[model samples]
Target: QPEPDMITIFIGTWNMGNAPPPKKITSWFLSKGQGKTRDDSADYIPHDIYVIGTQEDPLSEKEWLEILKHSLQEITSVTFKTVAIHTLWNIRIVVLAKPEHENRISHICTDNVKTGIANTLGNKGAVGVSFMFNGTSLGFVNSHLTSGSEKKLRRNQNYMNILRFLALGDKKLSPFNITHRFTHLFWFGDLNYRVDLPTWEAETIIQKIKQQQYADLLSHDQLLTERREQKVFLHFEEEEITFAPTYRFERLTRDKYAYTKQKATGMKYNLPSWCDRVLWKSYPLVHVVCQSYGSTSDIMTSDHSPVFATFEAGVTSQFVSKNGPGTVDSQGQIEFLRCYATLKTKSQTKFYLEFHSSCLESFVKSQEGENEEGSEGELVVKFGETLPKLKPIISDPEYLLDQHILISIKSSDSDESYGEGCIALRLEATETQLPIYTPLTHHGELTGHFQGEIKLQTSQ
Candidate 1:
């Protein structure tokens, strides 16, 4: 079943330009600065997933993973487990999930495409990582396309190339390529799409940033125009960008454009642009809400500032019952009822047991161990402390949407003897399966222990 609640994700993209990021990444993850004020007493929801993409990172894959692990540990007190990590040449992608959800990641697939000279080099390409989140597939692609100011067509074509060449899971069986394989797809990186205006005009327009006219300057963004024209990134959605240009900062001051370097080289200056970007697409059933989107300007280690976005993806679980199966009682126990069984000495008893709902059956079967064999034809009982346990037993095996079982309990092989004993059932929530033992019931009320000489059967 899918999750009924929303899962928060923090995604970040940076073109490190073969350089390491700042030692600390807390400021990048939190809305701590950038003209924003905060009250220390305030609290916020924690993210469930953290995905970071880097282009031109000089470190090896192992080194990059270690850096991410250490940085995450330093910033948050929660224990985040690594879900998956991938690297294709200069690009790397890492995904981490809160420890509670880490085991829900069932599968992972990765693929890459090289769009460099002769399409055989990794310097210019995309690295894609795909994984299953609670049975819902999700994909993340980190790309670094051609970087020329006028190479918009190449950038658009690079996107197509990545789509055509990248495959998740099995090539023929993975939904329909990376673009359509998952419930959600996050494509973010140093897309390298520049402003459309000439350098002088762009500079003139950017000066109005101090007047809160960044939106006016964004009106001439080439990437926006291209997306609107369906030239690239079709069907994808991006958060409304409210941050200033994140690229081409001076190495020393880091607050201004590279004016001195451009003048000294006797070359036209590259206008500031939002080169690092984040964009997403999702299945109709999944609702994505963007909580925040912006770039971290305080980190001056690279010419390109990193962009981060926070999103909440909503999913519906198959077993969403207000007071049906899996419901907790006043004591926080979950109880369900089925038909009882009786057997005579050396004789088998056959009865048909059915679940209240197919969703309930699926839920129970989803948690079954692979090595668990058929029932032992005895009045066997099972329960657990970390998971819910109370499985109805049947001889051999049978299959259906709802199930039917030919349960044969022979008194000759029974570990406990009873003339007619009531099955006492109590439902309780636990980290593992619950305990299933026979408690006596009188007048429809739960009583302790089985009546008479009935021995309570126990099995691990």
Candidate 2:
């Protein structure tokens, strides 16, 4: 039997929300030790492992990561190695280990489950990493659930699907369940669960955010309610939230909340909700203690405040020499070389569309191009709408809708589109090699047709 060793694990979750974030975000966790206001404060100690996750419009993660690396080293002076990093659409999770522990880490792998838009596109899903540290198994998941008050059930269902589909165990024919396979599991992200009460009522209770002021708002938290009702996250535990709500703040501002206004929707206020969250569940006999739980106020790039927690987990360990750290054998090396990867390619995804010239019904017009994968510029066709036979014409990818790409054929001088239709862009790797044909529609008419293929590149 292996003995247990106590180690500090720091976890953070944030929603970047497509904003160009500030250069350094180490305060998101590193500085928590000294300034901590937790009920029972735990002093700062260099973390043994770090699990960080983010959601929404994270094409800028590269810059954010470098900033974090610099900030962490500047503060702790510890050499950290990326053990695992992976993404599902815009959702990503990163696991880092200190250099001293690198020799003891192995079985690193990634898994993701899509829980958005007809159950296929990756815009909303849990991206995960699982590895063996010493003799203990650990799994970390970062997820973005569907948004809205009425969608609470969907969020619960999303949780169920992620737990059901994320393969982390050894069995190939039938993988082990995530919770069952891991000795310690950490799940965090922009869960998007809202406060159940009306916006005004909850806001008035938490507006001041002083002296357990937000405690009243806690009773109406959707995630808590769901857990109480046993609807989702059956055995998971979240630390008591002493911090204020972490969602729907006014952008570029601190200590203030905001509202949204639209053409038909005016004065739409998102109830101050604890949408950014971190939760964990551990196997029996695997003791875990949360030392601090709070939010970072300085990183104001997103409307949602970043939330974090530090834990002292009792991990099962094997007896080893207490000498200086050295490289481990090939069998013990962490899987996924992307951990120490060279940024050789700018992660890119492409689409090839095959259609006859007659499908356009109008000349090419330029206006906007963009989505889930980044697009360069305007939609450019191979022959400029003049090709007689159906050869492959290409279109850009991103902003995925209904697991398909929406193509709008517009005239050079007109408000109405000559044709608009969706072509399948479901990003499942199993079916990506085959091209699919879909019909184009406009004003109740089958005006065009096209066959499309999607290609992906590594930007890690």
Candidate 3:
């Protein structure tokens, strides 16, 4: 809307625990390309705050710290606090801060959100932090509440107690009057609560939100009408399309894994349900770009995929472009040349047109005549060699989280290259950081006029 002068925030919950993160697990978390280590791997934009849960492992605290220190190098300005709270499994909540805001932020204002009752119920502890942005301050509380059927209800109740406990911060001993400590607040993690369907205390939690006006910022009013009434068919079928399920799990436990379940595919190694969620206090002030949400997959990176949404202070009247790349009109056709610099897997640069099917085919038909009798018809098809790879991922360069890491490109066969063919790339920032606002710095084609790289791949 209004010129988009806003900060993008990413909230994700990861379960990084056990001995040395397991080679296979860490490999999936960070890609290892070339001879470079995963830290040097440029696949997935590094994040700010990881808010990790479940750090229980055979590794000692000292070893865990060293491993985490290694991982933090990729994301920049990250810190962690370790503790074994409720269960035998050690749980941790890691937080990352932007360099500029580093001074204002604290890893955790309180050690952990644990009270004696947590162990009484045989549950793990929970923790959270308070952060101030501009004049407005908010608290981000994360926890791996309670798991397993025998201890389910107790875990939910613990959350309620722990939450209310945090909300009533030092009220009993306050020398000066302190009313409601936090106004803008959100408590999210692997809460493991499912309200829509027949679940445990999920419905009760829903009632609590309604009573306290803690709206689920992740859901919009439009969804109730556009999605709720639509009864999706079972399994994979034509009418099978319906509101996407973020949680589609195969098993409640390792031994009970059900491969034939409706949500099996979505839940393979993870729990399947819309259990992971983002809740908020205000509606209109919160905005979530769907393209920026969800996970690459659910393979034990955590039992739950990170669910996040970007929010601005307010909304404005702006015409966000739904399409682009234009030129001098002729009939319904316009002739032009466009190219974009792309990163060859080797971290080298080259020029190429952004690949799209319908548009590229039309352009090819117009240039060499429809289907061109003897042309390379249906061979490489319309796109042919013109197509570059799709799903380009970039890892955060070590210790340079915000550095302008450039990817350069140039037209192939410069002499024959005509007009302009637009080249665009897709990038993915980590699930737990703010959106980068870097501009695409163009080289070769235009002078120094366009000299900015694309924002963190995720937002773009």
Candidate 4:
């Protein structure tokens, strides 16, 4: 055994069914102190990486992502940043990394394989992203397969399809297959496998879950049976599921089981199962240690509860690349008047803005729906070359401004075109120009950066 450079990750899966996310839903992702205490200092620190798998068709991709991103930033105290986000028909996954460690990640790539209609439709498939983390390649997969009480084989085939799917950007530079391309891999989502027992028998087994007698019930899990007896998940490993069944739950609460209404009067309509799961596989060079594995008992937005796993992985630290961008530059930035933007603490307060170049134009991008009514004069950037960086001249001098601001880089070539950028603005009643910096966290073992980075992909 050797000393390994380790990384901590939090992986979670939820099937939202397109439901609008709640306001304070971040607690479902954040860790509360032991025994319901409210000590923020005693609470567990946020992980270095967050890999969330969501199943359902969202009302709008851009809207949902912005909302979720803002909620996460609020809960983490503005320390986490979105690295990558992708969606299939009903399965979407997002990767959020700590700001400082953003530079340690590279070679980002994403793709999906349909396993629904004739194994070629978006309704059921797997979307995945692979990237080099601190010099080790890692792959994360979020999948939703065909569902039924007896569809174990179809789910297994879905796994096979995802394993064989190619994400080659260029033949010579990225020829590796899914399984062989990464040093470590994680797969999770609404797998939809059921128990092999009768409905009545399954419910009977669930009755003892309160007494911590779930082992007998797990022995009948269809996915586990397929893996143990039929060799389904060849080299993958899963933690012992110490939680109760995660499917067939009532919406908005976790008390009663809610099943379909088409069963006979005397038939057992509710057959709860561990349909959601998290599994991992790694090579000899990379070691994975499972820290925690279970389903959250509080979330009930969908019929399926979310399951989470925490892992500490040890990866090799030696690697090199030559072709990627030295630094990802804006396509045609007309430049920001100041690196940081400031807003007032009040919801209705408006701040003045300025810009250097007269050839520049700007637009507002916000997740809080449309701009406030009568929001007319805040759209354009107005300043001069000899402006000497306009500074705010009002309000209490010690008020700390803190907030996330979205910025756009107008194309010098065309007023209609723009590129994306961000500012970590501090909010205050007074308008002052301060240096905006991305958020960063400093927890002992989980410390890392979450800012965005673009790196070139090259084959060695």
What's the number of clashes in each of the models? 14, 6, 29, 12
Best by lDDT: 2
Question: What is the full ranking by TM-score, best candidate first?
Answer: 1, 2, 4, 3
Against the correct fold, how does model 1 do in TM-score? 0.65
Candidate 1 residue 79 Cα shift, in angstroms, is 2.9
TM-score of each: 0.65, 0.64, 0.39, 0.63
Candidate 3 C-alpha error for residue 400, in Å: 37
Candidate 4's residue-wise lDDT over 310-335, tens digit each?
78886544322231123222221222
Local lDDT at 26 for model 1: 70
Assess candidate 2 and give its lDDT.
Answer: 0.61
Model 4: what TM-score? 0.63
Candidate 2 per-residue lDDT, tens place, 1-460, comes to 3333777788888898777668767677553421233432332446888888888755655765676667668767876788888887788887887788887789898999988565445478889998877756788888898787778888877887887788874433121356545667898888988877765564465554544576667888899988888677766799888777888887777657664444532435577788988899775435689877788878888888778888889765532322212321111100011111011123222222222111122223233222132154323223222322211121112211112223444433334444443443334442124444444443323444444343422111
RMSD of 2: 19.7
Candidate 1 lDDT tens digits, 343-423 = 222333322221122212232211211111226543422111212333433111111111211111112223222221212
lDDT of residue 308 for candidate 2: 81
Evaluated against the true structure, the overall lDDT of model 1 is 0.59
Model 2 stretches astray by more than 4 angstroms: 1-4, 31-44, 117-122, 172-175, 200-203, 206-212, 260-268, 319-460
| Local error of candidate 1 at residue 138 (angstroms) | 1.1
* Models ranked on lDDT: 2, 1, 4, 3
